[PDB]
Design an enzyme around this catalytic site. Structure first.
Site, short mmCIF file in Angstrom:
data_model
loop_
_atom_site.label_atom_id
_atom_site.label_comp_id
_atom_site.label_asym_id
_atom_site.label_seq_id
_atom_site.Cartn_x
_atom_site.Cartn_y
_atom_site.Cartn_z
N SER A 295 0.85 -1.21 0.00
CA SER A 295 0.00 0.00 0.00
C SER A 295 0.88 1.25 0.00
O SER A 295 1.75 1.38 -0.87
CB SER A 295 -0.99 -0.09 1.13
OG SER A 295 -1.60 1.17 1.29
N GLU B 173 -8.47 -5.64 -5.35
CA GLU B 173 -7.91 -4.49 -4.65
C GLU B 173 -8.99 -3.59 -4.08
O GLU B 173 -8.81 -2.98 -3.02
CB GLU B 173 -7.01 -3.69 -5.57
CG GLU B 173 -5.75 -4.40 -5.86
CD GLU B 173 -4.80 -4.39 -4.68
OE1 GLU B 173 -5.13 -3.73 -3.65
OE2 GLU B 173 -3.72 -5.03 -4.80
N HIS C 176 -7.46 -5.95 -0.54
CA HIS C 176 -6.29 -5.11 -0.31
C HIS C 176 -5.69 -5.34 1.07
O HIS C 176 -6.34 -5.09 2.09
CB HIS C 176 -6.70 -3.65 -0.48
CG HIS C 176 -5.59 -2.68 -0.27
ND1 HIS C 176 -4.67 -2.38 -1.26
CD2 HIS C 176 -5.24 -1.93 0.80
CE1 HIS C 176 -3.81 -1.49 -0.80
NE2 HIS C 176 -4.13 -1.21 0.45
C1 LIG Z 1 -5.12 -2.39 4.06
N1 LIG Z 1 -4.31 -2.00 5.29
C2 LIG Z 1 -5.22 -2.33 6.44
C3 LIG Z 1 -2.99 -2.84 5.35
C4 LIG Z 1 -3.96 -0.51 5.36
C5 LIG Z 1 -4.12 0.14 3.97
O1 LIG Z 1 -3.36 -0.29 3.12
N2 LIG Z 1 -5.13 1.13 3.95
N3 LIG Z 1 -5.15 1.65 2.66
C6 LIG Z 1 -5.16 2.93 2.51
C7 LIG Z 1 -5.13 3.37 1.10
C8 LIG Z 1 -5.99 4.36 0.59
C9 LIG Z 1 -5.89 4.69 -0.79
C10 LIG Z 1 -4.96 4.07 -1.64
C11 LIG Z 1 -4.16 3.09 -1.05
N4 LIG Z 1 -4.23 2.75 0.26
ZN LIG Z 2 -3.63 0.85 1.28
#
Ligand SMILES: C[N+](C)(C)CC(=O)N/N=C/c1ccccn1
Ligand SMILES: [Zn+2]
Ligand SMILES: CC(=O)N[C@@H]1[C@@H](O)[C@H](O[C@@H]2O[C@H](CO)[C@H](O)[C@H](O[C@]3(C(=O)O)C[C@H](O)[C@@H](NC(C)=O)[C@H]([C@H](O)[C@H](O)CO)O3)[C@H]2O)[C@@H](CO)O[C@H]1O
Ligand SMILES: *[C@@H]1O[C@H](CO[C@@H]2O[C@@H](C)[C@@H](O)[C@@H](O)[C@@H]2O)[C@@H](O[C@@H]2O[C@H](CO)[C@@H](O)[C@H](O)[C@H]2NC(C)=O)[C@H](O)[C@H]1NC(C)=O
Ligand SMILES: *[C@@H]1O[C@H](CO[C@@H]2O[C@@H](C)[C@@H](O)[C@@H](O)[C@@H]2O)[C@@H](O[C@@H]2O[C@H](CO)[C@@H](O)[C@H](O)[C@H]2NC(C)=O)[C@H](O)[C@H]1NC(C)=O
Ligand SMILES: *[C@@H]1O[C@H](CO)[C@@H](O[C@@H]2O[C@H](CO)[C@@H](O)[C@H](O)[C@H]2NC(C)=O)[C@H](O)[C@H]1NC(C)=O
Ligand SMILES: C[N+](C)(C)CC(=O)N/N=C/c1ccccn1
Ligand SMILES: [Cl-]
Ligand SMILES: [Cl-]
Ligand SMILES: [Cl-]
Ligand SMILES: [Cl-]
Ligand SMILES: [Cl-]
Ligand SMILES: [Cl-]
Ligand SMILES: [Cl-]
Ligand SMILES: [Cl-]
Ligand SMILES: [Cl-]
Ligand SMILES: [Cl-]
Ligand SMILES: [Cl-]
Ligand SMILES: [Cl-]
Ligand SMILES: [Cl-]
Ligand SMILES: [Cl-]
Ligand SMILES: [Cl-]
Ligand SMILES: [Cl-]
Ligand SMILES: [Cl-]
Ligand SMILES: [Cl-]
Ligand SMILES: [Cl-]
Ligand SMILES: [Cl-]
Ligand SMILES: [Cl-]
Ligand SMILES: [Cl-]
Ligand SMILES: [Cl-]
Ligand SMILES: [Cl-]
Ligand SMILES: [Cl-]
Ligand SMILES: [Cl-]
Ligand SMILES: [Cl-]
Ligand SMILES: [Cl-]
Ligand SMILES: [Cl-]
Ligand SMILES: [Cl-]
Ligand SMILES: [Cl-]
Ligand SMILES: [Cl-]
Ligand SMILES: [Cl-]
Ligand SMILES: [Cl-]
Ligand SMILES: [Cl-]
Ligand SMILES: [Cl-]
Ligand SMILES: [Mg+2]
Ligand SMILES: [Mg+2]
Ligand SMILES: [Mg+2]
Ligand SMILES: [Mg+2]
Ligand SMILES: [Mg+2]
Ligand SMILES: [Mg+2]
Ligand SMILES: [Mg+2]
Ligand SMILES: [Mg+2]
Ligand SMILES: [Mg+2]
Ligand SMILES: [Mg+2]
Ligand SMILES: [Mg+2]
Ligand SMILES: [Mg+2]
Ligand SMILES: [Zn+2]
Ligand SMILES: [Zn+2]
Ligand SMILES: [Zn+2]
EC number: 3.1.1.7
Lengths: 533, 535
Positions: A199, A324, A437
């Site tokens: 991420s 995703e 995701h």
């Molecule tokens: C999924 N996890 C719980 C590991 C945390 C995460 O990855 N939250 N994701 C935020 C985000 C928002 C927009 C684009 C990418 N990521």
């Molecule tokens: Zn994320």
């Protein structure tokens, strides 16, 4: 014993022995790597930790950097596993080292993990990041650091020296400087340092690849479900100012040096309580405080540096999970919930497009909608739900990752791509979300090997396969085994053939194209349209 | 034979008995339905034929309206079968009647055929349009007429009274008026007239639905591979003037300005006008011939797309369809890298260029939308895929999606609509295998040509052709192509805007499928308009 007693450049550490079904591992948790970024050092680049008297207690994870704690589904493990598991503190710049218990007499290669969480959340002490299994299974050294998130890490008044920007990225770079200097005290090899993250962690890995002062602190890179060129991962300068000046107004703060001085007088909790309220669209896909294109860390937009870099000599492991987009839909999108089948309506769907593709024109949104409607079943709620899951997933993760992977491959890199397609048997989310995701990380880290969790016989085998691939890549830049019949099982990803593997319980399968057709829309047509309108 | 002498409002006719394997049909070929549109009458709407004395010899096809003759593949069966088969004359406004041998005792429904040819070509006297087999096998009456094409039927100087435009369409309406007045003489029912056409004839049938004075002259409509809302089928009054005066320049006619300009064009010999028709708008293929129906506000009070969205359509029975590979025939006529004699394995460069040929007059951004839509981004260099891809681009844009648009809008306003996709390639077919089922190659089967002993089609193909003749004859009799009280076969369900059901016509039994390239035609019918107007 003397195995748990190590001296790094700054002084003495006392670690802890952790158990693994395979055997013990030596762990040093919460090693300070920067002077605490507090008071006048809030919003500033981190200062290296100065040497200390006595023995630092590295037997337990240090504190979590200040952040909003999600309360969408309280007590639900699907959300709780990601929430902070230590006290929140601005005193949080600590790193962790795992190393084999017969501490390697020869220099073993080093994985460095950068956690994700959309630059607004995250912690190295989350249970799914426990380095002990990856280390004990594949005899590498594993390091992970905390870095400031939210306004603390990424508020910027481009121009000023008081809030320069990207200091959460500089937090990471400092810890890599620390690895360079001290990893060899634990058996690590400073000359084989592989960055991996998911991420925003993966987007972070992407920016170190584009930021020359970082490119010398690591040698291989793994990007999982993130890319620095994604629509959510950078912000312009003029916009970074508006967002900083707005948070200040929200917190009651009457020039630039004067602005930051007032923000510095506010309890950290007060900033966390308003930083989501900075933008009118309180969206997970345009969070207020992310890396800035200032001309410093990033001399140009991530897109610009990609299209122009010579990446000869780089190996890169890159991938996404199957679905995703489904995790983001329960955090906003109208009609959704982990607690029903989230059977969206057309208008709920048209509305959701604006939430997951924010800040595009009206014409662009219609394009998205015409592109993703099934015109034989235009109002099937199930199909609509899946469609929207694809719109946000393709636009925010998959097509960014794909676009980067091909550009790197085409300009000298050596890329290996995957799609994670296993739904954990423990997965507490609903079945329509699929493989969401973030839910490959448990397997990369070998968590199914923990006797107390309740994973499958077959699932432990899968996790070992994955750990093998990742350590193989750390060691050689090539996830395949150096010696094996039917040898090129996992082929490189190239802009032409576009081969990736699918990671799941069945043996590796090669497939062509990471949503090749879909991503033509996002990477190629949609920009031309936003332009000429 | 008493059956070959017939009298009509204009006078007496002598006809000819024709042989079918199944038995005789009596036919009246080359009935003058209009005073010849010559000299002072060139470009004018048709005057009705003054009545004659004696017996008109209605035993052989009359002339073919002046038109370009296809020199593309000399001698080749595939191109020659469409070429004029009588002398070209401006004296060409005649029609033909096939009627069952013992002339039907009770009023039988009438099928009127309107030929295609993109408004620059065609003639009622072509072999595949022989009515005998349909008339013998289904005992309906069949009519077909010649209408002016090219500049002779469609040159318009809007507001002139000298060249009002759409006179080729008025030609067809005059024949429909003749059918109303006279088909009774042949045992036909003027209260049960079904129009059917292909290509520009299908577009013509459509414009007759959209033009009130024609709605009194027929009751059902069949549109095969053509629609009045296609991009090639109509033209503005302002464009129509450019093209008219550009032709006048190419022929040496200094441009009252409207009356000088037309009187000069009248003096020029007919072949000289045919020679420069296509050079008014030079292009590589066949899309966008320059003399098509004009939106004048007389024959077409508004654009077809306007007229379709708010029209008098409830109770209309419409039969509607396309061939499987609508695009490929046009590509052979000038898409870069295309011939009938190789595999047409085009490069990406020729594919990009061919998109601008088949989709002309769209912005550079619009064309990129097309490319990025029909490219296979997994195999974007693959020449075979590119070839099929470009075939679909031009097939979708020019035929399939305009027909899908017309079908759903008619059905939405309460027309009974039946839709097919003709997907059988004739074992006789002379074009190369990669063109599949090309534009115009269902006509042979609708007309029962497989029954002709000289042409050696298959037995499977003969029973198929009899099957199609029955569908069309059922439709003409009753607005429903299905076997009246016979549900032993699969039903052909009507096309609705929601379920979008159509049948596949081939040698296998009826197969019901949903959506006429629904996904593809969203792009062409919905997005591309927005794109073009918003930028
Ligand atoms: C999924 N996890 C719980 C590991 C945390 C995460 O990855 N939250 N994701 C935020 C985000 C928002 C927009 C684009 C990418 N990521
Ligand atoms: Zn994320
Ligand atoms: C058959 C019979 O008993 N009498 C017909 C007589 O009705 C017919 O007159 C024409 O009737 C038609 C009915 O469909 C139209 O209403 C004609 O008006 C128009 C037309 O709308 O088609 C007006 C139009 O503006 C004219 N176009 C011009 C001047 O550019 C055309 C034009 O006259 C064409 O020749 C018609 O095809 O007519 C109405 O005049 C006449 C032939 O017109 O024939 C009788 O025998
Ligand atoms: C499916 O669930 C969503 C989310 O609602 C939650 O879960 C339900 C099972 C129910 O117990 C609710 O009380 C929960 O809050 C529903 O979307 C919500 O609908 C209400 C209607 O009163 C509306 O006020 C909320 O704003 C909606 N939430 C969002 C995010 O838009 C949805 O209606 C449920 N049903 C279907 C068919 O999807
Ligand atoms: C497949 O055939 C086409 C047909 O074009 C040619 O037509 C004649 C003029 C003659 O040159 C014949 O040999 C061909 O059948 C080919 O396209 C043409 O290629 C030539 C040169 O290679 C070029 O001068 C023309 O402009 C091309 N026609 C276009 C662009 O419309 C095509 O190259 C053939 N493919 C092969 C042979 O692999
Ligand atoms: C914004 O205003 C502040 C005042 O709070 C300026 O701070 C000055 O800092 C210098 C340091 O050498 C002092 O000597 C001045 O007395 C301060 N006050 C002034 C100049 O009014 C600060 O310079 C301003 N920020 C800018 C111009 O970027
Ligand atoms: C000879 N044939 C049966 C193929 C008639 C025909 O269909 N000629 N082609 C017309 C055309 C041109 C451009 C767009 C639409 N139709
Ligand atoms: Cl140090
Ligand atoms: Cl433990
Ligand atoms: Cl000491
Ligand atoms: Cl080195
Ligand atoms: Cl630095
Ligand atoms: Cl970017
Ligand atoms: Cl921005
Ligand atoms: Cl700006
Ligand atoms: Cl507060
Ligand atoms: Cl709050
Ligand atoms: Cl919030
Ligand atoms: Cl998939
Ligand atoms: Cl807008
Ligand atoms: Cl279904
Ligand atoms: Cl290489
Ligand atoms: Cl088990
Ligand atoms: Cl794909
Ligand atoms: Cl005569
Ligand atoms: Cl004259
Ligand atoms: Cl004669
Ligand atoms: Cl002549
Ligand atoms: Cl009617
Ligand atoms: Cl106009
Ligand atoms: Cl104009
Ligand atoms: Cl005038
Ligand atoms: Cl139109
Ligand atoms: Cl089809
Ligand atoms: Cl343009
Ligand atoms: Cl597209
Ligand atoms: Cl290819
Ligand atoms: Cl395929
Ligand atoms: Cl109705
Ligand atoms: Cl062949
Ligand atoms: Cl009836
Ligand atoms: Cl189907
Ligand atoms: Cl479809
Ligand atoms: Mg959250
Ligand atoms: Mg407040
Ligand atoms: Mg206020
Ligand atoms: Mg359905
Ligand atoms: Mg004569
Ligand atoms: Mg003559
Ligand atoms: Mg005018
Ligand atoms: Mg115009
Ligand atoms: Mg000139
Ligand atoms: Mg000339
Ligand atoms: Mg279905
Ligand atoms: Mg389709
Ligand atoms: Zn809040
Ligand atoms: Zn589209
Ligand atoms: Zn045609």
């Amino acid at each position: 014993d003397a195995e748990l007693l190590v001296t790094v450049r700054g002084g003495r550490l006392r670690g802890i022995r952790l158990k693994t079904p395979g055997g013990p591992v030596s762990a040093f948790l919460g090693i300070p790597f920067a002077e605490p970024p507090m008071g006048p050092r809030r919003f500033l680049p981190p200062e290296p930790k100065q040497p200390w008297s006595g023995v630092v207690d590295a037997t337990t994870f240090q504190s979590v950097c200040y952040q909003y704690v999600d309360t969408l589904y309280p007590g639900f493990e699907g959300t709780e596993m990601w929430n902070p598991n230590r006290e929140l503190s601005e005193d949080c710049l600590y790193l962790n080292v795992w190393t084999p218990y017969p501490r390697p007499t020869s220099p073993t290669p080093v994985l460095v993990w950068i956690y994700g969480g959309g630059f607004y959340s995250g912690a190295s002490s989350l249970d799914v990041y426990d380095g002990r299994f990856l280390v004990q299974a594949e005899r590498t050294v594993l390091v992970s650091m905390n870095y400031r998130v939210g306004a603390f890490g990424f508020l910027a008044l481009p121009g000023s020296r008081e809030a320069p920007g990207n200091v959460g990225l500089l937090d990471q770079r400092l810890a890599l400087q620390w690895v360079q200097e001290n990893v060899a005290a634990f058996g690590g090899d400073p000359t084989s340092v592989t960055l991996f993250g998911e991420s925003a962690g993966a987007a972070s890995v992407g920016m170190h690849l584009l930021s020359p002062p970082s490119r010398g602190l690591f040698h291989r890179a793994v990007l999982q479900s993130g890319a620095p060129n994604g629509p959510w991962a950078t912000v312009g300068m003029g916009e970074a100012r508006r967002r900083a000046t707005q948070l200040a107004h929200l917190v009651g703060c009457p020039n630039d040096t004067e602005l930051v001085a007032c923000l510095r007088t506010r309890p950290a909790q007060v900033l966390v309580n308003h930083e989501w309220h900075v933008l009118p669209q309180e969206s997970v896909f345009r969070f207020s405080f992310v890396p800035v294109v200032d001309g410093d860390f990033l001399s140009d937009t991530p897109e610009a540096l990609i299209n122009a870099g010579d990446f000869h000599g780089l190996q890169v492991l890159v991938g996404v999970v199957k679905d995703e987009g489904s995790y983001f839909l329960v955090y906003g999108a109208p009609g959704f919930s982990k607690d029903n089948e989230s059977l969206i309506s057309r208008a709920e769907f048209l509305a959701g497009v604006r939430v997951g593709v924010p800040q595009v024109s009206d014409l662009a949104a219609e394009a998205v909608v015409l592109h993703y409607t099934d015109w034989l079943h235009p109002e099937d709620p199930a199909r609509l739900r899946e469609a929207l899951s694809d719109v946000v997933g393709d636009h925010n993760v998959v097509c960014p990752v794909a676009q980067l992977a091909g550009r790197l491959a085409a300009q000298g890199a050596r890329v290996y791509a995957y799609v994670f397609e296993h739904r954990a048997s423990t997965l507490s989310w609903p079945l329509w979300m699929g493989v969401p995701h973030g839910y490959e990380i448990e397997f990369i880290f070998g968590i199914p090997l923990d006797p107390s969790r309740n994973y499958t016989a077959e699932e432990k085998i899968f996790a070992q396969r994955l750990m093998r691939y990742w350590a193989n890549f750390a060691r050689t830049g090539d996830p395949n085994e150096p010696r094996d019949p039917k040898a090129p099982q996992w082929p490189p990803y190239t802009a032409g053939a576009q081969q990736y593997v699918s990671l799941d319980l069945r043996p590796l399968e090669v497939r062509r194209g990471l949503r090749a057709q879909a991503c033509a829309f996002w990477n190629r047509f949609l920009p031309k349209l936003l332009s000429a309108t």
